[PDB]
């Protein structure tokens, strides 16, 4: 095992890393996945007691949905039957004009469509909701892959093709039609890929800022009857909508014509089956995850319980997470984490104040972001009003229940377009082992799920908590000023609040941060420092402010506790195949580098373990990088 001076991650996690098998039903095992499993176990036990009666109606619905999802017997007995009439319906839509003419039913009955609606805040007016117009994803895990014809692309397409053909076989397609449909679908997928942003581009917010008038939406999609169908669910049609990506919607009328309709139709049919299959028998849900497992190198499907709990969470995660927090997250832990967050924000203000490169105007607006920043702590006091509109009925099968929730969800959101953003909507449920920052709300969220070992304990020392949870708190605050966040004001609106020289100085730090991670190895895979720049900025400035809470002259034993606890909180063991996929899409660097890279920027690291120039965890002073705290 390496010395802590040579490899912090392996000196701390190396014993666990070498001995811990990755279970065949997982692609990764980690501090967070193991905690997630523990949480799931407890909550499944609790929800199992709540069908007949529960504390509230939404919790009864949550329990009911879990019971349906968990009913292996029923789901086995039904098999593929529940989907068959949906597939017959799509199969009778043989032409583009019949597709258009059926569009009211397709929209009503929650079918796979070439555009899907999502409602959230307008980036140029964060006080109000806007309709976002999303579309299909590509089969390859990055749209940029289609630029290069090679063996990996062929292998990935073959894996998907094998899944898709077997799913069509399950519903009675002949060998001939399997092949024809899969080939036709790939042809749509290949043409789609030309108008889907590369993953690197998806890491920048401005990629999603694609406003268009309602008329322009009609000009782009009215030939399919989609805008008209959507409009029936709204009191008024909005003046402005937003395309999720730049190039897809404008090109939809090339992508989907009467002549190439059959390629869309094949893709739509395969994807409807794949989507609904998640709610059918255990065999069929497993079949529907085959391709993603191939990409992950995962030998087996997830456990039945993990799968059934996942389904209940699709629609009732906030309700479940609210119950989790009310039940298992203590008032004294909540008060101590609340105090920690207040302290970190206070120290972040001190750091902006002491900062020596920001000009006065820019520094003030940075402070404004810390001034309006809101904190969502543990779990919501009040459930979001969506939960006045979701329901689950006793006798429904799982697919019927899921289709209803989807319909209720779509109908609710179509009614939110004339309305102000509800600040009571949380972006994470209370039991989630995660945390977040939302630039549109300028807020930070810390679900109860993450506020326990291995991240936090009332019984741990302040230095341990700072390392386990403080750096996370700091990370989330830092997202307000990362390369995305810095583009929004303290009201959640995209607005340039930087001077030219300060914006130039900032850009150079971002550039240095990409360079600090670019090309580093994980499991044999190259890390993309541009892709991951936003998260590496947040890690760096988050660790910085958390370290500052140790005071001006910390004891070495506390400096050590901070780094050890941080390092342990990141213990992660993943399949090399999963790394390859993740490292092409995820804005986060891998866990080993999130541990070993950032620390070497900070004098407290050198002081903690008396790190010398010959040590593996030594960075030359002129390569050390800090952000606000300089």
**C-alpha to C-alpha distance for 562 and 541, rounded to whole angstroms:** 15
Q: What is the DSSP string of 63-114?
A: HHHHHHHH-HHHHHHHTTGGGHHHHHHHHT--SHHHHHHTHHHHHHTT---S
**C-alpha to C-alpha distance for 523 and 22, rounded to whole angstroms:** 14
Residue 533 or residue 538: which is nearer to Zn ion going by CB? 538
**C-alpha to C-alpha distance for 35 and 37, rounded to whole angstroms:** 5
Residue 479 or residue 568: which is nearer to Zn ion going by CB? 479
Look up 476 and say whether it is catalytic: yes
Question: How many other CB atoms are there within 10 angstroms of residue 165's CB atom?
Answer: 19
Look up 353 and say whether it is catalytic: no
Residue 481 CB, nearest distance to Zn ion (Å)?
A: 12
Residue 46 or residue 535: which is nearer to Zn ion going by CB? 535
Size of the residue set binding Zn ion (CB under 5 A):
2
| Residues 486-525 as x/- pattern, contact with Zn ion by CB under 5 A | ----------------------------------------
Residue 271 or residue 478: which is nearer to Zn ion going by CB? 478
Residue 254 CB, nearest distance to Zn ion (Å)?
A: 37
Q: Is 276 exposed, middle or buried (0-12, 13-18, 19+ CB in 10 A)?
A: buried
Name, in order, each residue with C-beta under 8 angstroms of 352's C-beta and a sequence gap of 6 or more.
358, 363, 366, 367, 370, 628
Residue 202 or residue 538: which is nearer to Zn ion going by CB? 538
Phi first, then psi, for residue 161 (nearest 5°) are -60, -40
Residue 63 CB, nearest distance to Zn ion (Å)?
A: 33
Residue 541 CB, nearest distance to Zn ion (Å)?
A: 11
Residue 572 CB, nearest distance to Zn ion (Å)?
A: 15
Residue 149 CB, nearest distance to Zn ion (Å)?
A: 35
User: DSSP character for 444?
Assistant: E
Residue 10 or residue 589: which is nearer to Zn ion going by CB? 589
CA angle 143, 146, 151 (to 5 degrees): 125
Given 476, 482, 490, 535, the catalytic residue = 476
Residue 435 CB, nearest distance to Zn ion (Å)?
A: 8
**C-alpha to C-alpha distance for 50 and 30, rounded to whole angstroms:** 31
Residue 106 or residue 589: which is nearer to Zn ion going by CB? 589
Question: How many other CB atoms are there within 10 angstroms of residue 49's CB atom?
Answer: 10
No. of H helices and E strands in the chain? Answer: 28, 11
Q: Is 176 exposed, middle or buried (0-12, 13-18, 19+ CB in 10 A)?
A: exposed
Residue 479 CB, nearest distance to Zn ion (Å)?
A: 6
According to the binding rule CB under 5 A, does residue 543 interact with Zn ion? no
> Which element (helix H / strand E) includes 211?
strand 211-213
Residue 328 or residue 488: which is nearer to Zn ion going by CB? 488
Query: Measuring CA to CA, which residue among 199, 260, 253, 189 is closest to residue 226?
Result: 253
Residue 28 CB, nearest distance to Zn ion (Å)?
A: 18
**C-alpha to C-alpha distance for 431 and 326, rounded to whole angstroms:** 10
Subset of residues 522 to 541 that bind Zn ion, contact rule: CB under 5 A: 535, 538
**C-alpha to C-alpha distance for 226 and 264, rounded to whole angstroms:** 15
Q: What share of the chain is helix, strand, coil (3-state, %, to 5)?
A: 60, 10, 35
Residue 70 or residue 478: which is nearer to Zn ion going by CB? 478
| Residues 127-166 as x/- pattern, contact with Zn ion by CB under 5 A | ----------------------------------------
Given 32, 490, 535, 539, the catalytic residue = 539
**C-alpha to C-alpha distance for 433 and 35, rounded to whole angstroms:** 7
Phi first, then psi, for residue 241 (nearest 5°) are -130, 175
Q: Is 553 exposed, middle or buried (0-12, 13-18, 19+ CB in 10 A)?
A: exposed
**Residue indicated by tokens 């390392």:** 467
Residue 210 or residue 478: which is nearer to Zn ion going by CB? 478
Residue 540 CB, nearest distance to Zn ion (Å)?
A: 11
Contact 65/312 with Cβ under 8 angstroms? yes
State the residues that interact with Zn ion by CB under 5 A: 535, 538
Catalytic residue ranges: 476, 539
């Amino acid at each position: 095992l390496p010395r802590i001076q040579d490899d912090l991650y392996l000196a701390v996690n190396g014993e666990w890393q070498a001995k811990t098998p990755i279970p065949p039903d997982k692609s990764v095992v980690s501090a967070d996945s193991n905690l997630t499993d523990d949480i799931r176990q407890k909550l499944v036990a609790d929800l199992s007691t709540m069908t007949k009666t529960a504390k509230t109606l939404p919790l009864q619905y949550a329990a009911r949905l879990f019971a349906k999802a968990n009913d292996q017997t029923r789901r086995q007995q039904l098999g593929i039957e529940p989907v068959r009439d949906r597939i017959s319906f799509l199969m009778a839509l043989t032409t583009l004009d019949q597709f258009r003419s059926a569009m009211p039913k397709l929209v009503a009955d929650q079918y796979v469509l070439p555009i899907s609606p999502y409602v959230d805040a307008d980036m140029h007016d964060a006080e109000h909701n806007i309709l976002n117009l999303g579309g299909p994803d590509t089969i390859l895990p990055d749209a940029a892959m289609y630029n290069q014809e090679d063996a990996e692309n062929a292998a990935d397409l073959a894996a998907w093709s094998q899944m898709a053909a077997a799913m069509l076989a399950a519903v009675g397609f002949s060998q001939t039609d399997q092949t024809a449909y899969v080939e036709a679908a790939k042809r749509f997928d290949r043409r789609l890929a030309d108008y889907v942003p590369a993953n690197v581009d998806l890491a920048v917010d401005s990629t999603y800022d694609n406003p268009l008038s309602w008329q322009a939406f009609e000009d782009a999609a009215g030939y399919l009857g989609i805008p008209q169908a959507f409009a029936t669910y709204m009191p008024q049609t909005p003046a402005k909508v937003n395309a999720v990506v730049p190039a897809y919607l404008p090109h939809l009328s090339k992508l989907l014509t009467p002549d190439n309709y059959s390629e869309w139709h094949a893709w739509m049919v395969i994807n409807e089956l794949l989507t609904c299959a998640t709610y059918l028998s255990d065999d069929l849900r497993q079949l529907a995850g085959q391709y993603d497992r191939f990409l992950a190198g995962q030998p087996e499907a997830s456990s039945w319980t993990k799968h059934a709990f996942g389904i209940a969470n699709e629609y009732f995660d906030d309700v479940i997470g609210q119950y989790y927090g009310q039940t298992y997250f203590g008032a004294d832990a909540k008060a101590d984490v609340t105090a920690m967050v207040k302290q970190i924000l206070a120290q972040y203000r001190v750091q902006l104040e002491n900062n020596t490169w920001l000009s006065p105007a820019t520094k003030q607006k940075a402070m404004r972001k810390l001034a309006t920043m809101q904190v969502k702590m543990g779990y919501p006091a009040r459930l979001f009003s969506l939960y006045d509109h979701l329901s689950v009925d006793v006798d429904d099968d799982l697919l019927t229940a899921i289709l209803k929730l989807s319909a209720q969800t779509q109908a609710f959101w179509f009614k939110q377009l004339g309305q102000t953003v509800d600040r009571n909507q949380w972006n994470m449920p209370g039991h989630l082992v995660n945390a977040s920052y939302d630039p549109l709300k300028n807020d930070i969220t810390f679900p109860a799920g993450i506020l326990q070992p291995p991240y936090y304990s009332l019984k741990w020392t302040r230095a341990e908590n700072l390392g386990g949870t403080g750096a996370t708190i700091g990370h989330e605050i830092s997202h307000s000023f990362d390369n995305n966040g810095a583009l929004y004001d303290e009201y959640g609106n995209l607005h340039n609040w930087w001077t030219p020289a300060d914006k130039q100085a900032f850009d150079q730090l971002v550039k240095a941060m990409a360079a600090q991670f670019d090309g580093r190895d994980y499991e044999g895979v190259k890390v993309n420092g541009t892709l991951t720049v936003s998260e590496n900025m947040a890690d760096n400035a988050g660790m910085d402010v958390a370290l500052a809470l140790l005071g001006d002259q910390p004891d070495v034993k506390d400096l050590q506790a901070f780094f050890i606890t941080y390092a342990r909180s990141w213990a992660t063991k993943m399949r090399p195949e999963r790394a390859k996929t993740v490292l092409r899409q995820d804005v986060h660097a891998p866990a080993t580098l999130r541990v070993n890279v950032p620390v070497q920027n900070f004098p407290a690291w050198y002081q903690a373990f008396n790190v010398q120039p010959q040590d593996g965890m030594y960075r030359q002073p002129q390569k050390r990088l800090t952000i606000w705290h300089q």
